[PDB]
Enzyme design. Structure first.
Site, PDB file in Angstrom:
ATOM      1  N   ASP A   1       0.862  -1.203   0.000  1.00  0.00           N
ATOM      2  CA  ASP A   1       0.000   0.000   0.000  1.00  0.00           C
ATOM      3  C   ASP A   1       0.894   1.249   0.000  1.00  0.00           C
ATOM      4  O   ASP A   1       0.916   1.936  -1.037  1.00  0.00           O
ATOM      5  CB  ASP A   1      -1.014  -0.076   1.149  1.00  0.00           C
TER       6      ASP A   1
ATOM      7  N   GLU B   1      -1.319  -9.772  11.177  1.00  0.00           N
ATOM      8  CA  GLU B   1      -1.056  -9.283   9.800  1.00  0.00           C
ATOM      9  C   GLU B   1       0.453  -9.050   9.621  1.00  0.00           C
ATOM     10  O   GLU B   1       1.070  -9.509   8.582  1.00  0.00           O
ATOM     11  CB  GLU B   1      -1.790  -7.959   9.583  1.00  0.00           C
TER      12      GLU B   1
HETATM   13  O1  UGO Z   1     -13.549  -2.688   7.357  1.00  0.00           O
HETATM   14  N1  UGO Z   1     -13.088  -3.728   8.221  1.00  0.00           N
HETATM   15  O2  UGO Z   1     -13.863  -4.823   8.532  1.00  0.00           O
HETATM   16  C1  UGO Z   1     -11.752  -3.641   8.858  1.00  0.00           C
HETATM   17  C2  UGO Z   1     -11.668  -3.661  10.332  1.00  0.00           C
HETATM   18  C3  UGO Z   1     -10.440  -3.552  10.977  1.00  0.00           C
HETATM   19  C4  UGO Z   1     -10.415  -3.574  12.492  1.00  0.00           C
HETATM   20  N2  UGO Z   1     -11.565  -3.377  13.160  1.00  0.00           N
HETATM   21  C5  UGO Z   1     -11.597  -3.394  14.486  1.00  0.00           C
HETATM   22  C6  UGO Z   1     -10.364  -3.628  15.198  1.00  0.00           C
HETATM   23  C7  UGO Z   1      -9.203  -3.827  14.496  1.00  0.00           C
HETATM   24  N3  UGO Z   1      -9.258  -3.790  13.130  1.00  0.00           N
HETATM   25  C8  UGO Z   1      -9.218  -3.431  10.162  1.00  0.00           C
HETATM   26  C9  UGO Z   1      -9.304  -3.429   8.735  1.00  0.00           C
HETATM   27  C10 UGO Z   1     -10.596  -3.529   8.063  1.00  0.00           C
HETATM   28  N4  UGO Z   1     -10.808  -3.526   6.548  1.00  0.00           N
HETATM   29  C11 UGO Z   1      -9.792  -3.274   5.544  1.00  0.00           C
HETATM   30  C12 UGO Z   1     -10.079  -3.966   4.196  1.00  0.00           C
HETATM   31  C13 UGO Z   1      -8.772  -4.145   3.293  1.00  0.00           C
HETATM   32  C14 UGO Z   1      -7.700  -5.119   3.965  1.00  0.00           C
HETATM   33  C15 UGO Z   1      -6.531  -5.570   2.995  1.00  0.00           C
HETATM   34  C16 UGO Z   1      -5.327  -6.327   3.679  1.00  0.00           C
HETATM   35  N5  UGO Z   1      -4.363  -6.458   2.918  1.00  0.00           N
HETATM   36  C17 UGO Z   1      -3.507  -5.292   2.779  1.00  0.00           C
HETATM   37  C18 UGO Z   1      -2.211  -5.638   2.057  1.00  0.00           C
HETATM   38  O3  UGO Z   1      -1.382  -4.419   1.838  1.00  0.00           O
HETATM   39  C19 UGO Z   1      -2.410  -6.253   0.781  1.00  0.00           C
HETATM   40  O4  UGO Z   1      -1.046  -6.690   0.289  1.00  0.00           O
HETATM   41  C20 UGO Z   1      -3.234  -7.432   0.860  1.00  0.00           C
HETATM   42  O5  UGO Z   1      -3.425  -7.922  -0.475  1.00  0.00           O
HETATM   43  C21 UGO Z   1      -4.625  -7.153   1.586  1.00  0.00           C
HETATM   44  C22 UGO Z   1      -5.328  -8.417   1.783  1.00  0.00           C
HETATM   45  O6  UGO Z   1      -4.569  -9.257   2.607  1.00  0.00           O
END
Ligand code: UGO
Length: 765
Positions: A538, A735
């Site tokens: 991003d 993540e």
């Molecule tokens: O609206 N709601 O359901 C929400 C809630 C949240 C909370 N809440 C409460 C406490 C804590 N946290 C966050 C957040 C969100 N959404 C937003 C949609 C869009 C996502 C995308 C991821 N990634 C990024 C990276 O770069 C790339 O490479 C890949 O491909 C993709 C796939 O894996």
């Protein structure tokens, strides 16, 4: 014979709990058919159930954790749900029973257990919700002997061209069912199992929570009209007990109320198969399913040291079961802008202001219906196909069941339009669209996404070179079948490849630019002042301002990845004319990467723009982007530039942290600025690529063999331990991970590419 293999696979995968957007539910791989759903809620007051009922997946202070302990889509699995708010621990055991012509039978146990905090006498409302779509389909609740509801099992008998004839049974259950002394019990009974059989337009059957509440509200409306008031009210749990009214319709609501702990069973019996399924069959099949899962896990995911431990094995089973358990079947319409406005060509300075105005014309429209069978990143926050995510999701799934991964690939590439575009985010049907603001549903035929699925195909091609158990590997065991699979797909890959070169092209010939090839140079469409969403990364910093002269080194390298795959698959089908064109094109990219993207001053690959004064300028932001030709296996193992890259990779003052590789260098001016999404945090998917490539270098005669062998060893350890510590600590995959503290931040339940961790532990790449 490929047909015969194909037929068997359809019939094996047809049934699943392919509704990962809800805690537990079933649907088959048919767009309009029979679906089921679980809803539960403690009831302590006259208003509380609407705030306590559970159905769609969330993650807040009220919910400790949930996920699959064991899962195989061919056999089934077991899910654990730890609900603080409702003071319950819940187990959903699902198992599939082959037979007949309609894709088998299945069954499920629902065990509720009160936790220690919960009142021992808590009233728990449980619902099983059942719907059928089709103009030529029928479904009917067989009525009860007794007056006000059921003292025994509930039997639904139904029919459809898709599923043939079936009985779906909701058994009586173990558990105290509370009894009401109140006058209302003369007319509603003292408390029992009840069924409502309703009919609604086919397009709204998915809306189970509101459908339920309209019936609840009608029961309550009826109390008021018939002089039941606050003078002497009935118990809350009997106020929210529906009036029994079974019959025929396209919705059936089965409701139970339990005091304390409970369990009950769902038995779906394909008429076209043997005798009906029993509770005895459910227990047996569950035990049998664990023993297969156990034996396979040890074969396929042989955890190498220092992770041979049982703690690391229980961690491995959880990451894997949640990745593969989040597989869904999706069906409906997609929101696409098909204007192909000229502004989306982005050939102008300030192209982002133009494309903003074209989006403001709101030309987009629903199109389809489409169908997708995919694994997802996030059950609770975004349970839908993401194009480049799936290339990471299928790397471990492909180990476990290569036939299953190829069914998912086929599902993805059957979305391709005549141009060769697949939308990068698949929001199919109104059920999907309800979890997405209108502004972010619209897909754009000029927006791309890394071609990660080629990697999964690369792994397939290596294997092909060198009943549930039989089917799982049928495409590598039967080489005739494999090549036939490729023969059909190959055209589609070639189209997609040509799509990238038409739509994502950058400008050489109109600027002061020398290089080995005038053809090869690429630029992501869709980038804004501060973003490039189509790249996958991003907010990784890019040239300022965005410009039509831009060239993105990570995109060129992804083209690298495809040509190598097409070279590879092309060779196998003997497309001599084709492979020769790619061979030219691979040579060209190798030279042009260096000629346009290499910096001797900074010692790494960079993105490009053109200057204030119309000259080509490299813009260098040391991080994931800088490594990309390494991460994609494009550099020769004897390369001086690769050597320079291993130096930056190892360097603590730039990318190397105790917890894995930083997305961006501590030295870069944008380290830890703005939303800091890809501007310091450690992402398992990019780390996995670096790990797999180091290992390749380290297992080969050559100048960096030993340096490689050292970084592989530590990186593997750092990444696995950072994921594992946070799993022990919190029960979750995250993540991303914080390069200062090692804590998981952003989104929980990311299974999700963070589950690549099991393939890292098994090694032998
Ligand atoms: O609206 N709601 O359901 C929400 C809630 C949240 C909370 N809440 C409460 C406490 C804590 N946290 C966050 C957040 C969100 N959404 C937003 C949609 C869009 C996502 C995308 C991821 N990634 C990024 C990276 O770069 C790339 O490479 C890949 O491909 C993709 C796939 O894996």
């Amino acid at each position: 014979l490929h047909s015969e293999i194909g037929r068997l696979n359809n019939q094996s995968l047809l049934w699943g709990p392919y509704r990962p957007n809800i805690y537990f539910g079933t649907r088959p791989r048919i767009g309009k058919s029979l679906m089921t759903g679980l809803m539960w809620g403690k009831i302590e007051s006259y208003t509380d159930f609407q705030h306590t009922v559970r159905y769609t997946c969330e993650q807040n202070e009220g919910m400790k954790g949930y996920g699959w302990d064991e899962y195989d889509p061919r056999r089934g699995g077991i899910q654990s749900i730890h609900d603080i708010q409702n003071g319950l621990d819940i187990t959903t055991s699902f198992v599939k029973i082959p037979g007949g012509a309609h894709g088998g039978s299945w069954a499920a146990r629902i065990k509720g257990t009160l936790n220690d905090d919960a009142p021992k006498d808590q009233k728990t409302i449980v619902v099983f919700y059942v719907s059928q779509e089709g103009e030529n389909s029928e479904l009917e609740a067989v009525p009860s002997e007794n007056e006000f509801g059921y003292e025994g099992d509930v039997i639904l008998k139904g029919r459809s061209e898709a599923l043939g004839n079936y009985k779906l049974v909701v058994t009586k259950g173990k558990g105290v069912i509370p009894q009401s002394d109140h006058d209302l019990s003369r007319l509603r009974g003292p408390g029992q199992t009840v069924v409502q059989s309703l009919t609604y337009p086919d397009e709204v059957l998915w809306q189970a929570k509101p459908i339920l509440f309209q019936q609840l509200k009608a029961g309550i409306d009826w109390l008021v009209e018939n002089k039941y008031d606050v003078a002497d009210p009935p118990p809350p749990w009997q106020v929210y007990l529906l009036a029994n009214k079974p019959g025929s319709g396209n919705v059936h609501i089965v409701q139970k109320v339990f005091e304390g702990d409970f369990e009950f069973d769902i038995l779906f019996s394909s008429e076209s198969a043997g005798k009906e399924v029993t509770s005895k069959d459910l227990e047996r099949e569950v035990k049998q399913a664990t023993e297969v899962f156990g034996e396979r896990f040890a074969r396929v995911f042989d955890l190498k040291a220092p992770f041979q431990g049982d703690n690391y094995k229980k961690f491995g089973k959880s990451m894997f079961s949640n990745l593969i358990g989040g597989i869904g079947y999706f069906y409906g319409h997609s929101l696409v802008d098909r204007s192909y406005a000229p502004e989306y060509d982005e050939e102008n300075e300030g192209f982002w202001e133009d494309a903003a105005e074209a989006r403001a014309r709101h030309q987009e429209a629903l199109e389809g219906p489409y169908e997708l069978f995919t694994s997802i990143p996030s059950r609770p926050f975004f349970p839908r196909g993401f194009l480049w995510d799936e290339g990471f999701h299928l790397l471990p799934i492909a180990d476990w069941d290569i036939d299953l991964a190829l069914e998912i690939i086929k599902s993805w590439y059957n979305l391709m339009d005549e141009d060769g575009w697949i939308a990068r985010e698949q929001i199919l049907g109104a059920e999907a669209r309800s979890k997405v603001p209108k502004e972010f549903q619209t897909q754009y035929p000029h927006y791309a996404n890394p071609p990660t699925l080629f990697l999964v195909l690369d792994n397939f091609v290596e294997r092909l070179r060198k009943l549930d158990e039989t089917l799982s590997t049928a495409s590598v065991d039967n080489p005739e079948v494999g090549l036939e699979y490729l023969r059909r797909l190959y055209p589609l890959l070639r189209r997609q490849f040509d799509w990238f070169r038409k739509t994502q092209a950058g400008d050489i010939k109109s600027y002061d630019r020398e290089a080995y090839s005038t053809k090869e140079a690429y630029r992501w469409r869709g980038r804004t002042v501060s973003h490039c969403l189509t790249s996958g990364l991003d907010d990784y910093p890019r040239p300022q301002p965005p410009h039509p002269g831009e060239l993105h080194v990570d995109l060129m390298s992804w083209v690298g990845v495809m040509v190598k795959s097409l070279i590879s698959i092309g060779s196998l089908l003997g497309a001599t004319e084709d492979v020769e064109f790619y061979t030219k094109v691979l040579d060209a990219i190798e030279h042009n990467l260096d000629d346009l993207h290499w910096s001797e001053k900074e010692g790494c690959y960079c993105d490009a723009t053109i200057d204030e004064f119309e000259e080509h300028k490299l813009v260098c932001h040391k991080g994931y982007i800088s490594l990309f030709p390494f991460l994609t296996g494009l550099l020769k193992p004897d390369s001086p530039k690769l050597g320079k890259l291993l130096a930056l990779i190892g360097d603590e003052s730039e990318l190397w942290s105790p917890y894995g590789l930083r997305s961006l260098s501590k030295k870069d001016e944008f380290y830890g600025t703005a939303e800091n999404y890809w501007r310091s945090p450690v992402w398992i998917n990019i780390n996995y690529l670096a790990i797999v490539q180091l290992y390749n270098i380290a297992t080969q005669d050559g100048p960096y063999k030993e340096t490689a062998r050292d970084l592989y060893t530590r990186l593997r350890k750092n990444i696995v331990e950072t994921v594992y510590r946070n799993w022990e600590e919190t029960g979750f995959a995250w993540e991303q991970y914080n390069p200062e503290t090692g804590k998981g931040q952003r989104t929980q339940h990311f299974t999700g590419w963070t589950s690549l961790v099991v393939k890292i532990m098994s090694g032998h790449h």
